[PDB]
Design a protein around this ligand. Structure first.
Ligand code: UMP
Ligand code: UMP
Lengths: 290, 290
């Protein structure tokens, strides 16, 4: 029967199996095939410092970590993240990518009013990735933190990246579109709504990212981490990735690693990559992709 | 048994039951006790005209229908609904309610930049509930319809009411915060993200509302209805509703009613209450409590 060291990662694999077994076979934005279920939900225990970094296929932790800190900082400048040696946004801000979208006047690495800007300045008039936006638009992350501290019973602790007014100027429309927080018996929980998820790369990354976010905010608020709830619109596997995911489905998950913060923080803006430690991230062997 | 005429309503009852059994006890913003689960999801088939109006406890159909048409019209004037003998917004737009929020210059019924305003003019400058907003802000509903018709493969078909810039001026923050649409083999599906849901009174109403909207857009787009995915943040039952819900839980659901449109429509703005028929809405008798 179903006895597993890491039940939450096992359920993830079950999620992937269900997509491949019941999913619809459609052609997507690029003309490639996906196998897809619309509407899925899964839950991940964050208690005792557990962060859900998948063990059956390695997730780029360094990238997760630096992108999150960068999001939080409000930055929309791809070059700042490249300075931290993370290159996941590089191809979305280069001359060719920008020009193809009509952003011929824009400087390289200026990603437009993407996540960081929305999280910290929702409603402000975007100029460029070098403008000082202090006190412009709504600082959602700050409000979420005040709400958690002052009104922990609230059912309105929401942060959203989905800004229709700004979509035309973003290099990519937001994928993790919004999240909601929830305080129960001194524990902080988070639900991510992600409109679109690739189960082979994107989803594991987003999973770790919001897991880390919940850990950070919990610390800032003097709370213990709770449950991450991950909700998907179009959950899919690319049809060229099926063999690779099948190899992943065959593995018995290891225990998730643990997150550890090595100093105190004054606020959500007071973390640095050197004081966020990840203990015992053990992964199964590499899975080659195509 | 394990077999039901209406498996979808049966699953909703099981949802209520899961909350009562596994939910956490909380005292909310109102003061009354809730029993709560954070993060739930359920699916409702809409194929062949089916609309999930609950049968074990009657849903206020006239309210659902008139509110939706009013939403689509972009109106934020509560008096238009009161003109049709729908009083669900009355408490929220009267003198004392407005004054308590500091909207002391507002006429009665001026709900602020609520749903309808966000749907048709996201990012526009709110003045009052009589202002003509043509060409101001993003018409999200029209874009959704454009995307469904022209890019049915899109994983980006989103409409959101969650506007941080406008929250302070709304009489209530949006409860059904955003929805995503999905086209598969000519079948239109919709996922609602609801941040907060009263299983007893709110949720059934929200289900019927988004069910109806999905049927409407499907007709506009020459498509067929698919599935409604209902996602909840704080899924709760009010502690004083417990006994009446226990009664409801032993009822065997009847078949859902079906929706039928009795003439063609030029666009999403061309529906009227008289041409939306609801066939065979058969319910169990009223509950001995409220
Ligand atoms: O944070 C992200 C960003 C992207 N993707 C995946 C989902 C889609 O396969 C693709 C984005 O394409 P659209 O959904 O925008 O078409 O990348 C994720 O899983 N997570
Ligand atoms: O469309 C709605 C609006 C409200 N509610 C319920 C949920 C909560 O019980 C209450 C709103 O309170 P807050 O979640 O806003 O505190 O009404 C719904 O179920 N659906």
């Amino acid at each position: 029967q179903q006895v597993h060291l890491n039940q939450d990662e096992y359920k993830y694999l079950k999620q992937v199996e269900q997509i491949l077994r019941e999913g619809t076979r459609r052609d997507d934005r690029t003309g490639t095939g996906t196998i897809s279920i619309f509407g899925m939900q899964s839950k991940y225990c964050l208690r005792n410092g557990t962060i859900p970094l998948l063990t059956t296929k390695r997730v780029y932790w360094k990238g997760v970590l630096e992108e999150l800190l960068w999001f939080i900082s409000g930055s929309t400048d791809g070059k700042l993240l490249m300075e931290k040696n993370v290159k996941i946004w590089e191809k979305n801000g280069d001359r060719a990518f920008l020009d193809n979208l009509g952003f011929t006047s824009r400087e390289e690495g200026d990603l437009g009013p993407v996540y960081g800007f929305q999280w910290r300045h929702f409603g402000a008039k975007y100029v460029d990735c070098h403008t000082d936006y202090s006190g412009q638009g709504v600082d959602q992350l700050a409000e979420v933190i005040r709400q958690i501290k002052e009104q922990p019973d609230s059912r309105r602790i929401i942060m959203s990246a989905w800004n229709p007014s700004d979509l035309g100027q973003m290099v990519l429309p937001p994928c993790h579109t919004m999240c909601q927080f929830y305080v129960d018996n001194g524990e902080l929980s988070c639900q991510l709504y992600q409109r679109s998820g690739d189960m082979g790369l994107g989803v594991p990354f987003n999973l770790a990212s919001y897991g880390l976010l919940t850990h950070m905010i919990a610390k800032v608020c003097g709370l213990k981490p709770g449950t991450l709830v991950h909700t998907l619109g179009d959950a899919h596997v690319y049809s060229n990735h099926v063999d690779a995911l099948k190899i992943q489905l065959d593995r018995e998950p290891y225990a998730f690693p643990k997150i550890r913060f090595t100093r105190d923080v004054a606020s959500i803006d007071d973390f640095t990559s050197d004081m966020i430690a990840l203990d015992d991230y053990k992964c199964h062997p590499k899975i080659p992709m195509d």
